[PDB]
């Protein structure tokens, strides 16, 4: 699921660089 993976990304957005 798109929104499922999104929620995983959300946990670490604050780490991109």
């Amino acid at each position, epitope marked *: *699921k*798109e*929104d*499922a*993976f999104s*929620k*995983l*990304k959300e*946990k*670490f*957005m604050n*780490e*991109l660089h």
Partner: nanobody
Framework: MEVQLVESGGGLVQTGGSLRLSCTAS????????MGWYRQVPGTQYELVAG???????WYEDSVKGRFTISRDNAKNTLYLQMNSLKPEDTGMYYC???????????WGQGTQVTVSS
């Protein structure tokens, strides 16, 4: 991320028991931005149980905090979920999934069934 993922390590255990999930990648696992484990039962959206960043950062649903433990072994291209003190509420099909932020879905995997009954 154009990598194949295959989960294993599930099974049937008594409430309070443990087991450990593995998910091996066809590609180099250390180079995937985000990865994580989802629990799903019929009629309920994939719930993210635990996640891990490429850096090594980890996240955990509150339910599973202190009980489950996500880790990665980039050497052996494998992701793990060490599950302890299992409740019946933890019953469900467990998937592992990962990708980079450009990926819309990410790579998933067929999943592995965890049943917890007493």
């Amino acid at each position: 991320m154009e990598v194949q993922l295959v989960e294993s390590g599930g099974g049937l255990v008594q409430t309070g028991g443990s087991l450990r999930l593995s998910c091996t990648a066809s590609g180099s696992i250390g180079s995937i931005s985000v990865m994580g484990w989802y629990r799903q039962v019929p009629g309920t959206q994939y719930e993210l149980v635990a996640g891990i960043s490429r850096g090594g950062s980890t996240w955990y649903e509150d339910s599973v905090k202190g009980r489950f433990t996500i880790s990665r072994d980039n050497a052996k291209n494998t992701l793990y979920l060490q599950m302890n003190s299992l409740k019946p509420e933890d019953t469900g099909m467990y998937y592992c999934a990962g990708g980079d932020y450009s990926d819309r879905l990410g790579s998933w995997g067929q999943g592995t069934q965890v049943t917890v009954s007493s």
